[PDB]
A paper describes a structure:
The stator complexes act as ion channels, converting the electrochemical potential of ions across the membrane into the torque of the rotor complex. Two types of membrane proteins, A and B subunits, form a stator complex. In this study, we purified the chimeric MotA1/MotB1 complex from the E. coli expression system without flagellar formation, performed its structural analysis by using cryo-electron microscopy (cryo-EM) single particle analysis, and present here three structures of the chimeric MotA1/MotB1 complex in the inactive state.
Two of the three structures (Classes 1 and 3) were found to have structural properties typical for other stator complexes. The Class 3 structure showed a high similarity to that of Class 1, with an RMSD of 0.53 Å. In contrast to Class 2, neither a large cleft nor significant deformation was observed within the MotA1 ring. Based on the results from Class 2, it was expected that LMNG binding would cause significant distortions in the ring array of subunits, which would hinder visualization of the α1 TM helices. However, the structure of Class 3 suggests that the interaction between the α1 TM helix of a MotA1 subunit and the α2 TM helix of the neighboring subunit is not essential for ring formation, which would occur in a state of equilibrium between association and dissociation. In the structures of Classes 1 and 3, the two plug helices of the two MotB1 subunits (chains F and G) were clearly visible and were located at the periplasmic surface between two neighboring MotA1 subunits (between chains A and B and between chains F and G). Furthermore, the plug helix bound to opposing sides of the MotA1 ring, by crossing the linker to their connecting TM helices.
Numbering used by the authors:
A (entry chain F): 14 to 60
B (entry chain E), C (entry chain D): 1 to 246
D (entry chain A): 26 to 246
E (entry chain G): 12 to 60
F (entry chain C), G (entry chain B): 27 to 246
């Protein structure tokens, strides 16, 4: 019973996710922003 | 049905649905066929696997125990047992038989016949406690079905939200089909949590709460039958048995 | 009220509100109609379904036990229980009656009365332990209402959250200004978690803590009335009973 | 509907990982018992207890008239071995607390065998959901690392979440549900054995027939 | 609940991280109302207001 | 790390945790937390290996010299529970009664240490949920600034810090301390159970080799 | 696979787990942890069948040669628990006291194995929560500088790999080891209970058929 928190936290976060996904859905991502993170990510992933 | 369940369900509907209707919702907005099939179909499946069929066919008796209207009969049988002890102190054991030969409580009737037939006191308790613990096991075997159903359904919810995300995330670039898809990620959570916490787990608690009251009356009748065999004096019989009453 | 609860509730309100104000906010934005009605209405509905009505009518006595200030003068009754043993030793058991005509503790009175009437030791243990078991069962049955209120309220928080989002997204018709509307929907999770962990589960804990503190004093009185029957010496009586005191 | 919901690399992570966790978690001689475990889980009852009682009941009547010497008519070897052996401990050379002790050790052994079957399925059903998460996180680490266009990010993440769906569904529809049925049939088999211990001891006490059916029927639903 | 639910700590973790990703990606991108409009009517019919 | 520290997220989690233990227990219990920690971090200098030799010597003195010679030795012994035990047997009290009086003291010590641990077990049960409360009060405020993704990122980042304090304090401080109290309780109850078989074997007059055999089963 | 090693994620998850376990247990427990693993992974040399024949032999001896003959049969026997048990019966000690002396060794061995498994089970409880701490310290860093400063990718990694270490270590190393320790204690304790039932049956002088029938209940 010391684990009560995780079973509610889970739901809270989950509800946020599903909303935010939808939010992003009706938005457009400038390529410049994407590249800096995607190119920065791959090489830093140790690729 | 039963007064506390009737007040509970009325309060439940006015809270959950009546709150949503104040802020201008629609009842048909909370129905989604795919979410109901995943959560309730998934729950029913996990239950039919996890128990033999002769257990599943007992669920009517489980509900009938949970919502049995309450009876005060314990307060009557206390007087009967004391009267029988009063007879035992003063009269031949034939009176304990013929005083009981029409009695409505079967467990008491059988128990008294065991002492008038002259069976030994530490043998009588070994048949009476056998008859009790069979009744205790029957009610536990009812409650475990609802405790299982209320354990599976939440997780089938998470097997609904993820099977909802796998639809939405698949059509990110199509806002025309995102709408009907995102609904599953909400509603499958809602059926998973609401069924567990407003139907299954409350019923399980109430079966167990009514079982404890059934068993206490049997435990009182046992101390009754044994005190009649001992020939204990009426005031002390009243004093012992009254500890099982409130 | 119990002094620890008074300090506790002041600390609780100052921590929650003092934190919420310090990071910027006003209290009138933290109160919401539909969220309170769903979370508390749903909790009440789940508890009413979960228990017979005769249990729910005892809930006031749960609070009266929980916030009882600790008078308990076990250190005073110890001197009575020791002294009564000396009366049996010097003047025989029949002199005990005069010492206990009027004693405030009814459990002590009944125990001594069974001993002066000369009941057998295994019988006086049996008849007294039934009273302790009845008191222990009564206090457990108080606490389960608060434990079950505490396990439903968080999940009603989630249901109140999801119904909030369903209405906002449903009739969204809004100018990309959803931030306020979405935000309010999370107030139901705040009421669900706060009520469970600052009211229901803490009250349950205190009921169980005060129950154990009371049952110990009854178990002391049991060793008190058994000891006067066996006729132990004063030093051994004072040695035994002290093990039940902190 | 079934639309592209089968992915191999996701079944291999979940089931391969579950098998790895279970093989580490138990000695080999446990694993070789799983065939018996699943047969106990999904095996017809064809309960005859309503018959074993009749036999146990009848035997009492023989002892009351005919001496224990003629109680050896059970040497026909009633199909239930426990009853055959039990009554062969009531044949002379024995005493009541010793007959109880030898019989009750067989029951305590059989209760421990069935629990040891079910514990494998309980543990398998706990490891599988957690491996699902490992499969998902391994998938996400591969995608995010090598991201091309923002356009395909959506579809890729979806094929990655299937590990989780395989894991959680496997646990709550296969492993944990079986574990329940193994244990639920064990508590029905042990109950019959405890009844016979009631039969064997009572006959040795030479109790009256009518009481015999009252003691035994207590165990019968 | 028993230890069977011990996987919940982890599940939380997965979503929390996923949340980091999508929220992270959302901030960088402003919204084109046209997409916003279609969704608002795409959902309006579904929840039936 | 001056960006990982906070005022308000610490006040909601720690103040909320304190409010939840103060409501949850009587006042007289809360004043015992110092003694709980003093048990948990009691430096180990234990001498069970010394008391075993004392008990064995006492037995063979009782079996040779008669029970009344026991009185002289027990007076100076530092272990109060052992002293009282022998004093009962010097008083010639009956064996089922010596067991009863001694076992009440062991049960009382086991119950006291359980009552110490439960404060930390419950503190570590509340603190994660106060993290969730502190988080959600952050999000309710921030989601107001959703319009500008300029500050949404930085704002959310600080809102999750309440989760971090709630989980870190629970799993690195409260639940570990609770575990250590229980671990060091058992290793003190064991010593009392050994003293009990010591005192009873002195009363039965069993020979030194058998006493040394029985008592060593409580030692590692 | 070269991309799955991440220094800061290992330090948060394993350093956190080590810290939580060191707070949770006295040092004299942790110094015995090697013996936990050596119990888990030793081969099954189990020879219960070999001993069973020895006890049956001693019963047949005890009925015929007298109790004093048993000493010569156990004089150099490899199983110490059997040796001590038989010797207490040749020395003529009473049944309720030879029961009481033997059961204390079994209880000590059962407690010694549980003390090993709990350290492993605890490590498997903490490491997943260090996962959450590693993730959230990561999210606080990522959302802190969401200006595509080019550092987002490196910090997203830590947030993923801390999950992977926390979950994989718990469910492939620590918690799996724990199950084996508990399952292999239940081999040894069962064999000890068989040897006890052997020694008591030899003292009561039960015949070979009764001895073999009783002892078989502990074998499969």
């Amino acid at each position: 019973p010391h684990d009560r928190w995780m079973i509610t936290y889970a739901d809270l976060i989950t509800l946020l996710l599903i909303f935010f996904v939808m939010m992003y859905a009706m938005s457009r991502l400038d390529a410049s922003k994407y590249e800096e993170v995607t190119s920065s990510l791959q090489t830093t992933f140790q690729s | 049905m039963d007064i506390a369940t009737l007040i509970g369900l009325i309060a439940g509907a006015v809270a959950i649905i009546g709150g949503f209707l104040w802020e201008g919702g629609q009842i048909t907005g909370l129905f989604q066929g795919t979410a109901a099939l995943i959560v309730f179909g998934g729950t029913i499946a996990a239950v039919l696997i996890s128990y033999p069929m002769h257990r599943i066919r007992t669920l009517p008796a489980g509900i009938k125990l949970a919502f049995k209207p309450n009876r005060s009969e314990v307060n009557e049988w206390l007087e009967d047992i004391v009267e029988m002890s009063m007879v035992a102190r003063r009269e031949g054991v034939l009176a304990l038989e013929q005083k009981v030969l029409d009695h409505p409580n079967i467990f008491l009737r059988e128990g008294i016949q065991l002492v008038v037939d002259g069976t030994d006191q530490p043998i009588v308790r070994q048949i009476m406690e056998l008859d009790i613990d069979a009744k205790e096991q029957e009610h536990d075997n009812y409650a475990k079905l609802f405790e299982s159903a209320g354990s599976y359904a939440p997780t089938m919810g998470i097997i609904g939200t993820v099977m909802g995300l796998i639809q939405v995330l698949g059509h990110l670039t199509d806002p025309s089909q995102l709408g009907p898809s995102i609904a599953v990620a909400f509603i499958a959570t809602l059926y998973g949590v609401a069924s567990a916490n407003l139907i299954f787990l409350p019923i399980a608690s109430k079966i167990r709460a009514k079982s404890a009251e059934e068993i206490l009356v049997m435990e009182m009748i046992l101390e009754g039958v044994l005190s009649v065999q001992n020939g204990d004096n009426a005031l002390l019989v009243r004093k012992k048995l009254n500890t099982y009453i409130t």
